[PDB]
Amino acid sequence: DTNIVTLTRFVMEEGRKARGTGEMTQLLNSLCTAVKAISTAVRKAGILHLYGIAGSTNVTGDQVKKLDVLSNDLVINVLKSSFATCVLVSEEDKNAIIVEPEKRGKYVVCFDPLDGSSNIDCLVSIGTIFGIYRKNSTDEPSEKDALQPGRNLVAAGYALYGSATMLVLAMVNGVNCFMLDPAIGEFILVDRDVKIKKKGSIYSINEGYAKEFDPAITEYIQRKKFPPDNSAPYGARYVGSMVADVHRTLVYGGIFMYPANKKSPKGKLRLLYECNPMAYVMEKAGGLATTGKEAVLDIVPTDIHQRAPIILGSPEDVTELLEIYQKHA
Amino acid sequence: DTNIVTLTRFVMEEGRKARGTGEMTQLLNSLCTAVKAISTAVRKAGILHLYGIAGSTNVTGDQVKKLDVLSNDLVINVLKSSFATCVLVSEEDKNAIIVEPEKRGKYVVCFDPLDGSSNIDCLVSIGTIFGIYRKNSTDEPSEKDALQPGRNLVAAGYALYGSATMLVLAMVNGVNCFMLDPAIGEFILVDRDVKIKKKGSIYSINEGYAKEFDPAITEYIQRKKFPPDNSAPYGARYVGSMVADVHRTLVYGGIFMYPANKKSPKGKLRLLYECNPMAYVMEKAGGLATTGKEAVLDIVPTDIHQRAPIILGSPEDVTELLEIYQKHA
Amino acid sequence: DTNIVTLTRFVMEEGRKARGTGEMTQLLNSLCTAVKAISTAVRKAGILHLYGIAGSTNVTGDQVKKLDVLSNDLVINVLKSSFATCVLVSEEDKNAIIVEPEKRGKYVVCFDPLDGSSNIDCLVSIGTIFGIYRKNSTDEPSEKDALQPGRNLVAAGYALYGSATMLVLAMVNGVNCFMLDPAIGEFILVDRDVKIKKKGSIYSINEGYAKEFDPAITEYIQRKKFPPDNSAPYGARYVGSMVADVHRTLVYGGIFMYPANKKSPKGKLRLLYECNPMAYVMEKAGGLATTGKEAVLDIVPTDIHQRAPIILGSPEDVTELLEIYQKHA
Amino acid sequence: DTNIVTLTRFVMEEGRKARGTGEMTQLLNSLCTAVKAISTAVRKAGILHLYGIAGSTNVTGDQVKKLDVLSNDLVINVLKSSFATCVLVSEEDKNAIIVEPEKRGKYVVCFDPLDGSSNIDCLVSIGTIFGIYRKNSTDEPSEKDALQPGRNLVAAGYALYGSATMLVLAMVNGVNCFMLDPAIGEFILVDRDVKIKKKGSIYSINEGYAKEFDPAITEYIQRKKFPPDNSAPYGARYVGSMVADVHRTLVYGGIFMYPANKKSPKGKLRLLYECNPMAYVMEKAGGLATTGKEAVLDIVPTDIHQRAPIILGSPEDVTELLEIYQKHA
Ligand SMILES: O=P(O)(O)OC[C@H]1O[C@](O)(CO)[C@@H](O)[C@@H]1O
Ligand SMILES: O=P(O)(O)OC[C@H]1O[C@](O)(CO)[C@@H](O)[C@@H]1O
Ligand SMILES: O=P(O)(O)OC[C@H]1O[C@](O)(CO)[C@@H](O)[C@@H]1O
Ligand SMILES: O=P(O)(O)OC[C@H]1O[C@](O)(CO)[C@@H](O)[C@@H]1O
Ligand SMILES: [Mg+2]
Ligand SMILES: [Mg+2]
């Protein structure tokens, strides 16, 4: 046990193939430090009096929590000091953050410092989501640099603060899971080249929105409960934190859904720092991610805080739902 | 911050009122040690290779996981060395465990060493549930000592290994939450005299069993989705771990349900170490816990592993469901 | 590894022999909590900005450090809430602290909340020392209750914050070492019935006081450096923290000395909370502890802060020094 | 507290000045991981059963301890995976270790995986020492690459596992101290541009070697005990672990000595991984390090395990001893 395969070694030994400037490793290294700090505070939030609100409303509705601010500050700071980023997009910040010339790098990072706001106080799993882009312009860095389709992602993933803290990282060639060892403070590889099952047996959605669901979603759920071929009905799971439900979908298979509805044409989840990163992870794992009409990763954003419906998980499950939408179109 | 209000001080300063032998404090102290050990292993289960099965089937169906065995061993051992117990009942053990004469105490403890088996590998919140009884007999200790109705509980609660580890403890006069501070290894009081809201806005149940639900449950869910008075529909949440869903119900209010169905006359959850402890906590917090026809705490068990349907949470929500059952009776 | 032999179990399973009120276990339990808190802060004192002075001078000369105050507060508080003490004596407090009637127990505790003041800022090992007496009076508790000879100790020991944190505990039948496992926050038994070697090969004293040493000490040191029988000279060690040097003497054997000198008739170390506890530990381990003229444990104190010369360690080494004193008398 | 100034940021933001390949940061990053792992095991060595011998004798006399092997393995592995080293020299390895072509970097690292062997079992402070050189040759990497005078060091320091774990790092422009925060597993800057006092009041040496000391050392010690100008005698301190005694000398000032003697012409401490790193740190802090006749950093080694006498600390103290040697020459 004297040869620790940390996330840093893995990535460094990864980018070795395509010998680069090595700033991706600097970036992920910095992010890991922020995630460990968030994890430490979360595991003892009540003792630190970190539950409750901070007294503010972000770019859209959400009532800002104390952990939102703390985690947001930690991420912004480590990313800047990494000398690997130039444009930062955060759920908590109205406008994109342009990194000062002195600490600029070539990457653009979109992130949700803390996902699962509604589950903080009840101690349910929460997390951090991020998507990383390569600046594809010569002009001065600006918000436009973050308005790229998810297909242009070079790296994406999330930190899940669940029963254990896990950092799930996806890059061009695959998905790997690294678990944080609290004792030495290192993320250690525990799952290599993760692939999602072709078909699962769990569906995840907030059925409290039944009244607003479109005919397609309605039909699909009914089918999951009453299989036309007498097969066993799917089990239902909905933790309430996107990071938790998506991670379960990844390792157990099945489908996760936050579709558009009669009151929300574009669903709720944010495209830049919620939908695209998860869609990217899902596809590198052999899964699918759709709005119900088009691939999430192919949407070209016009607003860093725009929303997007999302249906992701096992290919056969997502495809089954797609056929329903096509049928009702 | 030099006056730590630990669970031990709290209880000790509690039992002071009714000056006893002090073995309840010894018992809870021992249990806290087991819970801290479980929490430590869980937060790093993958690194310790604790995911997966152990190769056995407990008293009923459940496929035994590695953490089931580890947690079960830890609990049995600390309880025995506490010199405060005489009869132990565990989900993992076919028959009751009689404590050797040398280490016998007056309490009977029923527990689920690790609840949320299906959510272990996906890193979703899991926990430990326990119920404590006072031996009300003169005969040699036996399994019969554990066959008491939940109303005879003198203490009950659970350890939740969620975003933070919390030990929720209920006794005759109330419910208190203690959070584990990983740094010093002490459970610290963070929530005093917890009370559940009279009415919530979240319903929690596995709707994958829609085909097997009785008319009452079916009507209630439909009502939560389509309120007859145009009020906002309830939100849906179902983590999949009883300890996680019940804790959210406690702090946020609402209702949790694992009713009987066409294939399970007595539901799934176990009365002794799952239903009664949660029912007890719920009632000391001002909530209700019913099978749909009778109070869970009033059932007189005949099998230490018998099952019982359970509906618990905010009084007004549970009562609303009860009226439906009565209506359909 | 599911049967943790903690200090609590050990003691509880110890006092079982002479079934008592069990408050000694409550007392040691409380003390363990304070020691874990001190250990946590010490391992990260610089990050917490706990180095430096607090701006005060205790009962005698010593310039009060920030950790002196923090550790003192923690110990006082846990001891009071233990319901096992009535009179407290601390190096940091001018007068004895009488516990309020409501939380009174039968034990008297003398302690040095933090020993090794001069080694704090250089990160050298430091610790906590304590001696416990049974109140042998009917009168209201007072300072006089702490003025008992060390031979009346019922328990004594120290917490060493060295490369690892160790709690060394001595009672009527022996000495045992318990190491703090930072991960679960429990002191675990690692050394049972510790006994010191009859003769060692290390001498420990501050030779910077050569000019003030009496003829006996001078002769002994010279003999350690130039053995009259051509044996190998003893090695010298002097960490500067009594707890560190005494612990090394215990496990490696040898001698530790802080004798009286031409400017300090009664040495420097305090009898109540430094000399007696270490003398007690030393004797229960088969060692000796003398002033050079009389056994430390036999001195009847008249001042809770009085000083006493001390020579302790392997019997043959201490006896050799005693013969020198007798020779020069 | 959301802007953590870690060792990594510091160094990275340091090497920024002289924009390099950045592999020094990779190297220090890797080393930090090994040091955290060693620190974790040390703080709980007894519980892990890591005390005792491994059953082997290194390059010279020393009886190999279990922690020697563990720490040695950890350091070798992290250094290799860093892609920043080509030649490794370890106290535990008879010959230099040549890094495989695939993972070669430009630095040569000499280190003592665990210093203070004799103080392990008594829980006294121990540590890790390292010195880093830049390969100044075109030939294939070999042992000769490590045979450079200490003046060619580009970085050196040590990890002290004392009351707190501290990583002291010296480079061309100065010395900085970083303390390990066990909670998040990051070394945090706590002391910037450290400078040693010009004159101290503590002398540190094993006086058990009085019989073998040369006239100069003998005279100096006598002078420290009996000041010719009636000034206060110096205090004596000798922990027994070079890393602990040197760190105290650095922060408190004074002198540390392990001179040659009648039986050891070149002292005991090893030049490559003990003397040079400490001499380098000492000089960057404004101190001195001599054999008594020549500067340690100017010695050109001929054996990777050769020994060297060493006298270091406050300039005025070291100079005073030098004048004595010159006087006796
Ligand atoms: O309560 P709702 O509408 O189901 O929203 C839950 C979703 O919202 C989020 O909290 C984002 O705000 C996701 O983490 C989660 O999937
Ligand atoms: O998958 P299902 O049938 O919803 O069962 C989930 C329930 O089973 C349990 O895992 C008990 O086995 C509970 O913790 C949880 O509430
Ligand atoms: O610096 P001196 O005089 O050797 O004193 C050291 C002694 O003083 C103490 O720090 C007590 O104040 C002991 O821990 C230690 O043994
Ligand atoms: O016991 P001695 O001869 O004083 O040796 C102590 C010295 O040896 C070392 O342990 C090296 O082996 C140093 O850490 C320490 O300074
Ligand atoms: Mg939000
Ligand atoms: Mg979110």
Ligand SMILES: [Mg+2]
């Ligand atoms: Mg968020």
Ligand SMILES: [Mg+2]
């Ligand atoms: Mg089970």
Ligand SMILES: [Mg+2]
């Ligand atoms: Mg269960």
Ligand SMILES: [Mg+2]
């Ligand atoms: Mg279970």
Ligand SMILES: [Mg+2]
């Ligand atoms: Mg003092």
Ligand SMILES: [Mg+2]
């Ligand atoms: Mg002291």
Ligand SMILES: [Mg+2]
């Ligand atoms: Mg003190």
Ligand SMILES: [Mg+2]
């Ligand atoms: Mg050695």
Ligand SMILES: [Mg+2]
């Ligand atoms: Mg060494």
Ligand SMILES: [Mg+2]
């Ligand atoms: Mg060594």
